[PDB]
Each structure stands twice: as structure tokens, then as C-alpha cells.
Amino acid sequence: SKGEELFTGVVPILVELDGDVNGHKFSVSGEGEGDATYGKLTLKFICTTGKLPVPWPTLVTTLVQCFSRYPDHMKQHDFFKSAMPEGYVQERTIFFKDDGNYKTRAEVKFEGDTLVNRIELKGIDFKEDGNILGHKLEYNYISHNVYITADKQKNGIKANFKIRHNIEDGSVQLADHYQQNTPIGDGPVLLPDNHYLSTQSALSKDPNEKRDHMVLLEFVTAAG
DSSP: OTTGGGGSSOEEEEEEEEEEETTEEEEEEEEEEEETTTTEEEEEEEETTSSOSSOGGGGTTTOOGGGOBOOGGGGGGOHHHHTTTTOEEEEEEEEETTSOEEEEEEEEEEETTEEEEEEEEEEESOOTTSTTTTTOBOSOOOOOEEEEEEEGGGTEEEEEEEEEEEBTTSOEEEEEEEEEEEESSSSOOOOOOSEEEEEEEEEEOOTTOOSSEEEEEEEEEEEO
């Protein structure tokens, strides 16, 4: 089980995101640690360019599934850890219903003992007065699952899932995700049988942090 050993204890994480939505540029940096044994992620993200032009909840999925807890009987289906330390490229298109879309390209890999997630995000066709640019989304999270399937044609995995972002009027802003992950090394990786990753999220704020930011606590477990 190559790559698994790199996740046996607590691992420091660094996230770097460069975005541009409807021409509005922004950057986000994140730091924290992951404990894959418990499928636990603890991270704090900061918008280093000022005010985030989009809702923090809409960036959660974009901002390291290698930290998921895979039950012992499912260890042969952990594509994410198997690609380490070289890593994998993670790409998505996220369609916000009745609004614009995000296109993301990220590289997740180890740089020394730090697991790094470096992201490029481009958003187009958003409504200036819509739920995203207008910041009309509640600061929380309710979606949990994603069905992961193998993508042999690309020697990786893929997934399609909907994320629901609660709005104050009781309605929901849908964010339809289409995902594809491919290894960075020419090395071996595990192409998994179908399964789910179920994530419990928790968004919060550091009462003593003045910069625009997001504190995130997540627990992810594989099943199915």
C-alpha cells in the first residue's frame, strides 16, 4: 500500500488558490492539518487580497480527499493516497443553477512533509445580483456525499455530485459538480471500485480574525 504510510500520523496542509470570477480576481491561502486515520481535516483559510468576491461555502469543495478515512475493508479503493507523494491533478466544473460556473484545476501533492493543494479557479457567466456575487448564501454546509467511480480512460477517478447551498428564503442554490482526477506521476495507482465518500462539515469564524476568512472542520469517511 504505497502512499498510505505518508498519512499514518498528523500531516500539515497548505492550500493556495488563485481565482477570477467575472473578472474579479482574488487569492486564498489555507493552513491546517489532516489526520487520515480519523478522516479529520482542520483548516483556516484567509482571503489574502481583501474581501472574497464569492461566498466561502462555494469554495469548500475546491479548497484533499487523500485525507478521507477508508475503512480497512476498503483500503484497496484509496486512489487519493495511492498517488502520493507525486500527487494528482484534480479538475472540476461546478455549475451554479440559474447562475455562472466555476472551472478549477488543482495539483495535490507533497512538498516535503507538507500536503499541498495548489488551485487555479475561473468563474464565468455569474449574475452580479445573483446568489453568488450578491453573497446571498448562508454560511454553513449540508451536503455530504459523492459517488467516486474509476475513470480507466484517464487512469484515475471521476465523480458527479450536487451540492446544495442554503439561502435565507428557505430555498437552495444548487452547485452541480463534475470531477476528474488523474495522477501526476507515471507511477502505480489504485483504480477503485465504486464507492462513496461521506463528509461532515463545519464552517466557523475565528472571533479574533479581522481578515475575510473561513475556519473549516471536516470529517470524511469512505463507504459503499
